[PDB]
Amino acid sequence: PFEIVFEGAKEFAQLIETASRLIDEAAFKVTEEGISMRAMDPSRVVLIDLNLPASIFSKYEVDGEETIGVNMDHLKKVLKRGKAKETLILRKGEENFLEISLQGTATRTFKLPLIDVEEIEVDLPELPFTAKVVILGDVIKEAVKDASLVSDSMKFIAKENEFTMRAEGETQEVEVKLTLEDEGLLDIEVQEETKSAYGISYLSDMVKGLGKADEVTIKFGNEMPMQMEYYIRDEGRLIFLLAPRV
């Protein structure tokens, strides 16, 4: 029996879309600290970790702690119906429904039957990540879209003070180098030579929904999963975990 009030519903709908393009259902671990999400793709190739501290909400009213079970598709269509500045509200009382209130010029109320979600909890804390880089959003977004031309597996190469991406197919070749000197490369933390490869499809699901004013974190080691991260209103950030190939 809670209520929640979040402003800028279009943003929240965007991020919920982001989580949506990989999994179809998911549960929301609502605690008085904040709203939490954590789930994995069907393929067991990517891990979506959503963290929402209550501070971000214009109002945050939780009485206890409970897990919501919702159809990410239905919620995605619903939240997608919100716009730029209309206010989002999330209410839940006794009954087994979630009430979404979009109030901008007017109030609109939706109800979503909650669905049971068999939870498979796999918490994966910090791991041996050789290199760690921060980079503007549109840099990586452009890059992935480029590797979409020539292949389906994008290879990452992290060298001392230099970050380079690449991909090769039958004939064509794609390369994207950039270093700290370059503008888009905000930071590089080189411990040593790192190299990996990742499913360009999964990356495309990842980086869609990124403007130029989007900073992204990338930790990873030689032939091991990437962990990507980026903040949301500077408090609650999302983190993906992508297993490499080969």
């Binding site: 994995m40 393929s43 067991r44 190739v45 498979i120 796999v122 999963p225 297993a243 190939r245 080969v246």
Partner: protein, 554 residues
Amino acid sequence: AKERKMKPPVQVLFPIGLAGGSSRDIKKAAEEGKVAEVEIAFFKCPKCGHVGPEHLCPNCGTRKELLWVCPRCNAEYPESQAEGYNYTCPKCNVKLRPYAKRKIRPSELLNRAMENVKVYGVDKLKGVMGMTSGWKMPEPLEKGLLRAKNDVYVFKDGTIRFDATDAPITHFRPREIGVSVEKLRELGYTHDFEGKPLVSEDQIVELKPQDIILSKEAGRYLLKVAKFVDDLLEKFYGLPRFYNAEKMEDLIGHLVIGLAPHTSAGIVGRIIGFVDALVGYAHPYFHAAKRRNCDGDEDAVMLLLDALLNFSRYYLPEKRGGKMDAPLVITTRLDPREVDSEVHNMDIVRYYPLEFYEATYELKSPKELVGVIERVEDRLGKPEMYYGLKFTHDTDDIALGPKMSLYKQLGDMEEKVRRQLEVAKRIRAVDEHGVAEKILNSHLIPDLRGNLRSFTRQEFRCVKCNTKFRRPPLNGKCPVCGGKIVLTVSKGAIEKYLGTAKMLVTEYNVKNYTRQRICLTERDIDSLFENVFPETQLTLIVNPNDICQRLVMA
């Protein structure tokens, strides 16, 4: 209770060739202004000398004589002339064809159609890729426009059919079918089955032989057929309207020809009401004389005046008399003698006699007591075949109950089997946990294995050069085409049932033989492609207790 739509939906019998595109939509070919090359028949206005594939003249409006063609000398002869020549050329020893591969201007024709019938707002007008009838005489376009305008589909003879699973009845409570007792007094139904005078909407009347209670589907479609037949009477033939149907309950009393598949003699019937289910009821003499088995058979139901106005043998395909056929003749009077056999065994007793029930216990074969219980063979010849039947058990409604099977609201095989075998845990009788799977599980094994065996022996085929080379051309190009060859039985097919079949094995006690067969077929699917789809994407959470690996660890 669907409609009868040809496989490519049709709405007019007029050959268009490729000129309409994929769905052979004539109106695209019109507005795109293309020109067609399709075998057709032309008629010639004797008065004026106009030529065109229509029946009446544009110049003067008289009937136009058929034009015959020599396939050698391409000679054209009006009908009476080719009648003299016995339809064989004078300077060619060949038979005169009625048709010829010709040049059609869909634009001016369709314009003449809209001009004739005064209808312009057709979304599309799906035609026929090619006349298959012998004459290859095309239907007039006007009728196609009227079909499209009302959105009713056509079948190969020119009649509009409506499949419905048929079930029997012999007595009905006018509550059930939604009919006023005064109306039933207008159809002839005087007295209910015990002879008492019909006064109330809860007395069981006896269905007379050729009445039928249509499903409201059939109402909702045959209504459209009624508006069609009106607009065809008036706009095209110039006659008074005939049905004036506005709700479905206007049809009550209008005859429908019930026709089977596989036969060519339909039975005239009368409509007397509607129910809600998807099954068109009828007196079993009807369903028998239509040759049905009523062990689930499905039948066609067209309106009378439609089949009269729109049928002609000339449209009948020439060679493949298939599973459906057309009302070559219609019966107008049941006689249960020459109906069928399977009717002749019905039990028409009001209650099974005591002697029977005691007579079962020693398992007497049925013919040892046929003389006791009345039947239909025990009333043939007499006039009281039609007069009075009976029935042991009342229902409350003929339609009460879930009116659409849960089978059709189930999309994915993955959970198809989860419902199908969801049930069998519920019942005592089925004992899934070992045999609903294994029977069904055996079916899963066969399809996957068959596909796997076949895959390595398949054929190839292009979208545009249908010609599929029993082998890949090293180039990957194609004849006529400069394109690519698609794979016939795609790898998405081989893997289509592994999820389910693996599910069943991980859940339900199934004989080890089939389990090892399935895990083994998993390994075969992988090692069949260990050199085209290499193992690339590692996964981070390994072994969620898969039965294959955890089996092998034994």
